[PDB]
Enzyme design. Sequence first.
Site, PDB file in Angstrom:
ATOM      1  N   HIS A   1       0.799  -1.219   0.000  1.00 61.06           N
ATOM      2  CA  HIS A   1       0.000   0.000   0.000  1.00 61.06           C
ATOM      3  C   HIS A   1       0.835   1.274   0.000  1.00 61.06           C
ATOM      4  O   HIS A   1       0.325   2.343  -0.359  1.00 61.06           O
ATOM      5  CB  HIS A   1      -1.049  -0.017   1.098  1.00 61.06           C
ATOM      6  CG  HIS A   1      -0.589  -0.078   2.496  1.00 61.06           C
ATOM      7  ND1 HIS A   1      -0.474  -1.269   3.193  1.00 61.06           N
ATOM      8  CD2 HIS A   1      -0.259   0.899   3.345  1.00 61.06           C
ATOM      9  CE1 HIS A   1      -0.072  -0.990   4.436  1.00 61.06           C
ATOM     10  NE2 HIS A   1       0.050   0.338   4.553  1.00 61.06           N
TER      11      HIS A   1
ATOM     12  N   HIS B 265       6.368   6.872   5.853  1.00 59.48           N
ATOM     13  CA  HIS B 265       5.882   6.409   4.578  1.00 59.48           C
ATOM     14  C   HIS B 265       5.256   7.582   3.837  1.00 59.48           C
ATOM     15  O   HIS B 265       5.230   8.711   4.342  1.00 59.48           O
ATOM     16  CB  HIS B 265       4.928   5.244   4.809  1.00 59.48           C
ATOM     17  CG  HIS B 265       3.760   5.730   5.585  1.00 59.48           C
ATOM     18  ND1 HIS B 265       3.645   5.710   6.962  1.00 59.48           N
ATOM     19  CD2 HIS B 265       2.674   6.302   5.089  1.00 59.48           C
ATOM     20  CE1 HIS B 265       2.474   6.281   7.258  1.00 59.48           C
ATOM     21  NE2 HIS B 265       1.876   6.628   6.116  1.00 59.48           N
TER      22      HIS B 265
ATOM     23  N   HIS C 114       2.168   8.913   0.704  1.00 54.26           N
ATOM     24  CA  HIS C 114       1.008   8.740  -0.154  1.00 54.26           C
ATOM     25  C   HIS C 114       1.200   9.632  -1.379  1.00 54.26           C
ATOM     26  O   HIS C 114       1.691  10.757  -1.242  1.00 54.26           O
ATOM     27  CB  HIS C 114      -0.286   9.135   0.569  1.00 54.26           C
ATOM     28  CG  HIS C 114      -0.426   8.451   1.873  1.00 54.26           C
ATOM     29  ND1 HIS C 114      -1.073   7.227   1.964  1.00 54.26           N
ATOM     30  CD2 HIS C 114       0.039   8.714   3.143  1.00 54.26           C
ATOM     31  CE1 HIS C 114      -1.069   6.835   3.235  1.00 54.26           C
ATOM     32  NE2 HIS C 114      -0.324   7.663   3.941  1.00 54.26           N
TER      33      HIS C 114
ATOM     34  N   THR D 273      -4.961   6.757   8.662  1.00 53.42           N
ATOM     35  CA  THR D 273      -5.612   6.956   7.372  1.00 53.42           C
ATOM     36  C   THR D 273      -5.647   5.651   6.595  1.00 53.42           C
ATOM     37  O   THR D 273      -6.250   5.633   5.519  1.00 53.42           O
ATOM     38  CB  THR D 273      -4.978   8.020   6.476  1.00 53.42           C
ATOM     39  OG1 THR D 273      -3.701   7.489   6.054  1.00 53.42           O
ATOM     40  CG2 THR D 273      -4.881   9.352   7.200  1.00 53.42           C
TER      41      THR D 273
ATOM     42  N   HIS E 277       4.361  11.011   5.919  1.00 50.35           N
ATOM     43  CA  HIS E 277       3.878  10.765   7.275  1.00 50.35           C
ATOM     44  C   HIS E 277       5.021  10.155   8.082  1.00 50.35           C
ATOM     45  O   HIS E 277       5.485   9.060   7.742  1.00 50.35           O
ATOM     46  CB  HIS E 277       2.685   9.792   7.256  1.00 50.35           C
ATOM     47  CG  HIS E 277       1.434  10.414   6.648  1.00 50.35           C
ATOM     48  ND1 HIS E 277       0.309   9.768   6.178  1.00 50.35           N
ATOM     49  CD2 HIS E 277       1.157  11.732   6.488  1.00 50.35           C
ATOM     50  CE1 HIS E 277      -0.560  10.662   5.736  1.00 50.35           C
ATOM     51  NE2 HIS E 277      -0.103  11.859   5.966  1.00 50.35           N
TER      52      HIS E 277
ATOM     53  N   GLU F 204      -3.244  13.403   1.307  1.00 47.44           N
ATOM     54  CA  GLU F 204      -4.420  12.953   2.064  1.00 47.44           C
ATOM     55  C   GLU F 204      -5.110  14.161   2.683  1.00 47.44           C
ATOM     56  O   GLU F 204      -6.269  14.410   2.361  1.00 47.44           O
ATOM     57  CB  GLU F 204      -4.040  11.916   3.116  1.00 47.44           C
ATOM     58  CG  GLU F 204      -3.572  10.638   2.451  1.00 47.44           C
ATOM     59  CD  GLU F 204      -3.582   9.403   3.320  1.00 47.44           C
ATOM     60  OE1 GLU F 204      -3.088   9.444   4.433  1.00 47.44           O
ATOM     61  OE2 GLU F 204      -4.078   8.394   2.835  1.00 47.44           O
TER      62      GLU F 204
HETATM   63  N1  V8I Z   1      -1.210   7.105   7.256  1.00 50.00           N
HETATM   64  S1  V8I Z   1      -0.986   7.206   8.822  1.00 50.00           S
HETATM   65  O1  V8I Z   1      -2.266   7.494   9.422  1.00 50.00           O
HETATM   66  O2  V8I Z   1       0.151   8.032   9.121  1.00 50.00           O
HETATM   67  C1  V8I Z   1      -0.429   5.587   9.348  1.00 50.00           C
HETATM   68  C2  V8I Z   1      -0.180   4.602   8.380  1.00 50.00           C
HETATM   69  C3  V8I Z   1       0.337   3.362   8.754  1.00 50.00           C
HETATM   70  C4  V8I Z   1       0.602   2.296   7.716  1.00 50.00           C
HETATM   71  O3  V8I Z   1       1.809   1.874   7.773  1.00 50.00           O
HETATM   72  O4  V8I Z   1      -0.181   2.137   6.752  1.00 50.00           O
HETATM   73  C5  V8I Z   1       0.541   3.109  10.104  1.00 50.00           C
HETATM   74 CL1  V8I Z   1       1.154   1.542  10.613  1.00 50.00          CL
HETATM   75  C6  V8I Z   1       0.316   4.066  11.066  1.00 50.00           C
HETATM   76  C7  V8I Z   1      -0.163   5.309  10.673  1.00 50.00           C
HETATM   77 CL2  V8I Z   1      -0.418   6.512  11.904  1.00 50.00          CL
HETATM   78 ZN    ZN Z   2       0.130   7.761   6.007  1.00 49.75          ZN
END
Ligand code: V8I
Ligand code: ZN
Length: 257
Positions: free
Chosen positions: A61, A91, A93, A195, A116, A103
């Site tokens: 993802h 990571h 998006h 998210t 993020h 996002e």
């Molecule tokens: N997109 S996010 O809300 O930062 C988020 C994404 C992930 C993921 O790896 O998909 C995880 Cl484990 C924690 C958070 Cl807090």
């Molecule tokens: Zn994220």
Amino acid sequence: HWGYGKHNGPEHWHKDFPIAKGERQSPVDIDTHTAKYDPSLKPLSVSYDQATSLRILNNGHSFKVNFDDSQDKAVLKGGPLDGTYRLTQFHFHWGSLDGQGSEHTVDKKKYAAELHLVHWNTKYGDASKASQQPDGLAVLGIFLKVGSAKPGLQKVVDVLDSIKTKGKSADFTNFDPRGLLPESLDYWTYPGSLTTPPLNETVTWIVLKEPISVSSEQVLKFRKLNFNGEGEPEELMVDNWRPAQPLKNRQIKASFK
Ligand SMILES: NS(=O)(=O)c1cc(C(=O)O)c(Cl)cc1Cl
Ligand SMILES: [Zn+2]
């Protein structure tokens, strides 16, 4: 099973994750005129000089870089936070085109991508326990716009062809996340959620006002990743963003101006 396609995308997630229609979901649209300057916010402290990166991973993802969080090495404090939050991973998006990917939106404007940096509250001992607590996580969100190259991102883009497909990982030590930050730490903050499934409502969001610039060549490399595993039909990893969710009974607070 969940993903970002027509048949398994964000409009479907509520069937396996009913909190998807909850009272504090993320992302949201940040209405800059409605957000209120909050004089009680303490200075934000991003302390990443001792960060220890470990590995980079295509998880089907996104791609993710994890960090050694067995001690207080890279932490976020201050701002709206109480106590100490340790960096565990970052990571991104991103979109299929430069005008979508983020996002969070800012007065309905979508950026090309969003970074993020995920942190957990050390009062809960481990990230699993933290992720189940209303004040357990803090994410520092950073918008990417296409323009000039970001030098501190180039080491990330250069390793992506070694993790093309779901499940592949590579060594990613000695990476310095300070090279991903903009100049200003001005921010908006609000209570929200993961998210991605399981969409836990356990996140204090800290979204920086100032985007970083990345080159078209850098974002194009993101779009060469695959959602699929090796030897499956190739589906490019693009548009892995959840759209803005209802704000409901929440205030967005601004650190500035
Ligand atoms: N997109 S996010 O809300 O930062 C988020 C994404 C992930 C993921 O790896 O998909 C995880 Cl484990 C924690 C958070 Cl807090
Ligand atoms: Zn994220």
